[PDB]
Amino acid sequence: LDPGLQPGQFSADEAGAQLFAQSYQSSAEQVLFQSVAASWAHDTNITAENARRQEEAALLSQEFAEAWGQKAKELYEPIWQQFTDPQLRRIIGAVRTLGSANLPLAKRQQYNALLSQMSRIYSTAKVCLTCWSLDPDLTNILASSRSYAMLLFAWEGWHNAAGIPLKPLYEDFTALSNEAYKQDGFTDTGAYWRSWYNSPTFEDDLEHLYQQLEPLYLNLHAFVRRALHRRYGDRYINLRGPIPAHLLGDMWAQSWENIYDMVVPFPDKPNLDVTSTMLQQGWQATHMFRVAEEFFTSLELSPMPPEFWEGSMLEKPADGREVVCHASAWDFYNRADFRIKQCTRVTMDQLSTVHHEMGHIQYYLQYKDLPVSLRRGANPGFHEAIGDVLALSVSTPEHLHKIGLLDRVTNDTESDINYLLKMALEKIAFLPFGYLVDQWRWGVFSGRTPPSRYNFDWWYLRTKYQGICPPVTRNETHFDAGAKFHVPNVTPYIRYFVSFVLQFQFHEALCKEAGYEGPLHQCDIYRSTKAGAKLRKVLRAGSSRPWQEVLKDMVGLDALDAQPLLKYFQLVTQWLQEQNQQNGEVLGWPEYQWHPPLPDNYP
Ligand SMILES: *[C@@H]1O[C@H](CO[C@@H]2O[C@@H](C)[C@@H](O)[C@@H](O)[C@@H]2O)[C@@H](O[C@@H]2O[C@H](CO)[C@@H](O)[C@H](O)[C@H]2NC(C)=O)[C@H](O)[C@H]1NC(C)=O
Ligand SMILES: CCC[C@H](N[C@@H](C)C(=O)N1[C@H](C(=O)O)C[C@@H]2CCCC[C@@H]21)C(=O)O
Ligand SMILES: *[C@@H]1O[C@H](CO)[C@@H](O)[C@H](O)[C@H]1NC(C)=O
Ligand SMILES: *[C@@H]1O[C@H](CO)[C@@H](O)[C@H](O)[C@H]1NC(C)=O
Ligand SMILES: [Cl-]
Ligand SMILES: [Zn+2]
């Protein structure tokens, strides 16, 4: 470790720890910057040489974290917890957690290389026979093909191509990750991930939320299953069984927006999916990002700085070059550089993804002046909810009218149901998936799910929560979890479930602050400077305060609460129940063993 980056001497008391944290912050920004910069260079240009550089940078980060971590322990182990300064305890608590820097050097290299190889396999995997990429080719097929055989070819092809080679690497990664975090005092990596919520009853609290939400999902599922049955027939759709996992518009069946045209209750009302209008009008990536920015500035939040426009990658590069297409928002930790990397396509769901990613950036802009350790959301679910809350206003027919994407205006019960059903396809359908992913991973980290049961336990959870089944046979050579970006990229997932509840709590509070006084689902906070000020206080706080207190100031309650979500969806919840009863549906999938046959000439 370069001399200028190494820790000096500090007295063993709160006054020294303040000087320590300031010296740390000088050197940390340089170290974070080089790490993020090397990751950027790799992820926008996947080559062997860029992976090598990234590995070296990660290694430097570890040397940094070890030196400053072990000094923090040496001086403040017995006493950091009793510091008067809450911000300082949070800083010292972060610096003392070494993570992968607890591993000896040879295992650090192995860990760094596994992350790099797993990333590569996911982002370069192809389906052949002339080769399709995930983004855009398979994405587009899952979205818009209504051919059972074509969808199956894409689904199976992707799961096989990405999952199978990841399996041996993921096993080695899990063992190293656990060994690392066990030296920080955690029973397993999952226990560390959960510690971010700073709640002793986190798992129970989440289970209690899911219990309230489950009926909404069961009714949506049943209604959609019926529509699919009318399309695909009795051979491929079982009205008492799980839905084949490739038919819901998305590779992971995680949001069902893309099958909106098959399930729309009242097709004579305005067409609420404005993708065809965006194409018809010649929208490009750059317009999408400008439109999102202007929402932010309408609230008197910050514009994207020059550095964002100059540095970002907003389209898939046309020179063939390999990139990580999965959308992400980047803080370089120098208070100047912030970027989005997205292989943007011109669709309505991409418009929401653009807002999601710009949400992250906005967080980074508002807390950039905090100590590095505090540059994060109050919890990870907060960071995930910011852009989604704005996108709730954007997708309102009223708002779409104002930005020229929906010519016809209507305010009637049928139009309301169409809108709420579309939003349910996006939000309610996702809930089981958001909850299940880390239940899977927590099991793997704890050792409840050994390699020999990775796929069996994955599909157990997929069926249990989503009520889907694999459309071809799977065995433990398959590693279907590995075909979802966040697993090889080691990104936690429970944040999204938290986000999907929290965003409706935020929505409710911001609407009320805006002075709006109609139905919650018709609220648009566009141009509300007051809503903007309330959101700004959250973003500026970073992780400097407990998330429960931040939530209380914002929404008036110190806990996650499903009631705002329930209220938002109330009309369609009631409608869907009524539709399902009158059609005599079975709620759930009691033929839990059922799988569809292979199509006649498959492949
Ligand atoms: C769309 O219409 C709803 C329905 O409410 C109307 O109430 C009267 C204003 C009258 O127009 C009736 O035909 C409808 O029943 C509007 O919501 C109401 O808004 C007022 C004040 O903004 C509020 O006090 C009411 O409680 C609201 N209605 C209820 C009970 O939900 C709504 O504002 C209209 N939305 C748009 C996008 O124009
Ligand atoms: C490294 C994390 C990237 C991630 N990228 C997005 C596209 C993402 O993976 N997700 C999650 C997903 O796509 O699995 C769901 C989440 C809900 C709204 C839109 C997409 C959001 C993010 O910015 O959280
Ligand atoms: C991609 O990386 C290679 C080396 O790995 C480098 O020489 C090349 O310039 C990069 N491509 C672009 C255009 O960024
Ligand atoms: C798993 O499935 C594939 C194809 O369906 C097959 O080749 C393989 O032998 C199966 N069993 C094992 C033990 O992997
Ligand atoms: Cl998380
Ligand atoms: Zn996100």
Side-chain angles (χ1 to χ4, degrees), residues 38 69 135 148 209 230 252 268 369 380 450 459 495 510 547 580:
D135 189 0
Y148 187 98
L209 286 168
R230 291 182 274 235
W252 303 281
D268 246 25
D369 286 316
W459 281 105
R495 55 183 64 178
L510 296 172
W547 72 261
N580 287 325

Side-chain angles (χ1 to χ4, degrees), residues 95-237:
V95 170
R96 194 212 100 84
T97 291
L98 272 73
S100 73
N102 285 299
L103 296 171
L105 168 65
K107 282 174 159 165
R108 285 177 200 180
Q109 295 160 297
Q110 178 188 355
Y111 181 79
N112 293 345
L114 289 163
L115 295 189
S116 171
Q117 289 324 306
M118 291 196 295
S119 169
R120 182 188 43 67
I121 286 153
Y122 182 84
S123 284
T124 64
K126 295 313 200 265
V127 177
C128 293
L129 309 172
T130 17
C131 292
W132 292 330
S133 59
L134 176 59
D135 189 0
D137 304 314
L138 302 173
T139 298
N140 279 345
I141 295 168
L142 268 287
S144 72
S145 177
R146 308 285 161 83
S147 162
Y148 187 98
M150 185 61 225
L151 289 163
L152 180 58
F153 181 81
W155 187 94
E156 172 184 50
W158 174 252
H159 283 77
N160 294 347
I164 295 168
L166 288 166
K167 196 172 173 190
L169 282 76
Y170 195 78
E171 307 185 12
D172 288 357
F173 157 76
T174 291
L176 284 168
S177 174
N178 277 349
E179 174 174 349
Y181 283 103
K182 202 201 321 306
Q183 293 268 73
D184 293 318
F186 296 96
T187 187
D188 63 62
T189 298
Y192 167 63
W193 287 3
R194 296 187 300 268
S195 70
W196 299 330
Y197 288 89
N198 196 22
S199 172
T201 58
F202 189 48
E203 286 175 80
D204 288 341
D205 291 342
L206 289 171
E207 191 172 35
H208 294 166
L209 286 168
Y210 196 73
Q211 289 167 5
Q212 298 194 68
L213 295 172
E214 190 175 7
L216 275 63
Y217 183 65
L218 290 185
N219 278 279
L220 174 70
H221 182 275
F223 180 77
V224 165
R225 179 175 55 198
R226 169 64 62 182
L228 293 173
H229 180 264
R230 291 182 274 235
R231 262 50 155 225
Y232 284 108
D234 210 46
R235 177 167 178 67
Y236 288 124
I237 299 288

Side-chain angles (χ1 to χ4, degrees), residues 156 160 164 472-478:
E156 172 184 50
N160 294 347
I164 295 168
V472 294
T473 305
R474 320 298 295 153
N475 64 40
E476 286 297 339
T477 293
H478 304 120

Side-chain angles (χ1 to χ4, degrees), residues 243-518:
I243 301 174
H246 68 307
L247 300 179
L248 295 154
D250 169 285
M251 186 61 77
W252 303 281
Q254 68 179 61
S255 76
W256 303 355
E257 44 270 52
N258 288 304
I259 59 170
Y260 176 68
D261 27 44
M262 277 183 277
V263 309
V264 43
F266 305 99
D268 246 25
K269 297 296 171 173
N271 182 5
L272 286 185
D273 184 318
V274 299
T275 300
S276 53
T277 298
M278 294 174 71
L279 292 164
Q280 185 249 308
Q281 293 180 351
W283 285 65
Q284 306 284 29
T286 188
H287 306 81
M288 300 173 59
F289 281 79
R290 290 290 181 179
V291 167
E293 181 189 45
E294 195 282 320
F295 198 116
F296 286 88
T297 53
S298 87
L299 304 175
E300 284 175 341
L301 297 178
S302 308
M304 299 309 95
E307 293 80 352
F308 170 93
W309 299 104
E310 297 302 295
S312 289
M313 192 205 78
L314 302 184
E315 276 168 4
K316 191 164 177 168
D319 59 15
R321 137 171 71 131
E322 301 263 18
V323 298
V324 176
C325 271
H326 192 88
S328 58
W330 294 63
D331 189 351
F332 288 75
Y333 292 96
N334 64 1
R335 287 176 274 101
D337 288 283
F338 312 89
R339 313 180 175 177
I340 284 169
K341 183 192 52 51
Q342 175 170 351
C343 291
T344 301
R345 290 163 293 107
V346 182
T347 77
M348 186 178 199
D349 58 73
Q350 283 281 283
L351 186 61
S352 295
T353 300
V354 171
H355 283 84
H356 174 84
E357 301 304 333
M358 200 168 277
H360 285 315
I361 299 293
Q362 188 68 223
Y363 224 149
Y364 307 156
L365 305 166
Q366 291 296 339
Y367 66 35
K368 65 167 183 287
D369 286 316
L370 296 181
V372 280
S373 303
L374 306 188
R375 291 181 203 162
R376 62 187 99 218
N379 70 41
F382 275 57
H383 226 294
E384 302 305 330
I386 309 310
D388 284 22
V389 176
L390 275 66
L392 290 169
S393 277
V394 167
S395 57
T396 64
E398 205 188 20
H399 187 87
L400 293 168
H401 183 65
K402 294 160 188 163
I403 63 178
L405 287 181
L406 188 57
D407 179 49
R408 200 187 148 199
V409 184
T410 63
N411 187 14
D412 55 69
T413 55
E414 295 79 1
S415 298
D416 254 340
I417 295 306
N418 280 350
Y419 175 67
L420 285 170
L421 190 275
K422 190 166 172 293
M423 293 303 307
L425 298 166
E426 177 177 347
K427 301 292 184 185
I428 291 164
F430 179 82
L431 292 178
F433 188 78
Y435 191 30
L436 86 80
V437 170
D438 279 353
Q439 288 192 248
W440 185 79
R441 191 153 50 167
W442 297 343
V444 175
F445 283 129
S446 68
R448 277 159 12 255
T449 302
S452 68
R453 287 194 284 285
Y454 276 4
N455 226 40
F456 169 69
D457 280 2
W458 178 248
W459 281 105
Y460 169 83
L461 286 168
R462 296 266 275 168
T463 299
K464 172 178 178 182
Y465 287 107
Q466 293 179 271
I468 62 176
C469 61
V472 294
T473 305
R474 320 298 295 153
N475 64 40
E476 286 297 339
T477 293
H478 304 120
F479 175 43
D480 293 333
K484 173 63 185 160
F485 169 93
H486 298 72
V487 167
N489 290 279
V490 194
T491 299
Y493 215 74
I494 193 64
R495 55 183 64 178
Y496 300 112
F497 177 80
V498 176
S499 172
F500 274 44
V501 173
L502 203 65
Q503 68 189 250
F504 291 93
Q505 295 179 253
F506 286 2
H507 187 60
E508 181 184 62
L510 296 172
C511 294
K512 167 164 217 186
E513 182 68 0
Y516 172 82
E517 280 178 25

